[PDB]
Amino acid sequence: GVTQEFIETTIQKITVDCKQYVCNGFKKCEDLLKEYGQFCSKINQALH
């Protein structure tokens, strides 16, 4: 008898351009987003 088992070893590695994802390159959006701290850097570091 043959028992088949799948054991995953990877997930797809995704890096998100936080600034472009949130603001789409708009100066007003970036100014309003800067009030949230350093969120984009935290996201980048976490994903990396």
């Binding site: 600034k19 984009c40 850097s41 980048n44």
Partner: protein
Amino acid sequence: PFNDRKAWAAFYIYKLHPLTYLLNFDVEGYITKAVDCGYDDFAQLQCS
């Protein structure tokens, strides 16, 4: 006058541009170093 003639210095004028800068603040509160975010790819890495 020719008795006490002196050679004076020169001043340099640099234009100010609207740019994103990564500023590093000293323990005394002074900006000791900065990064021009759009200047280089390493600078983009530092700013992101």
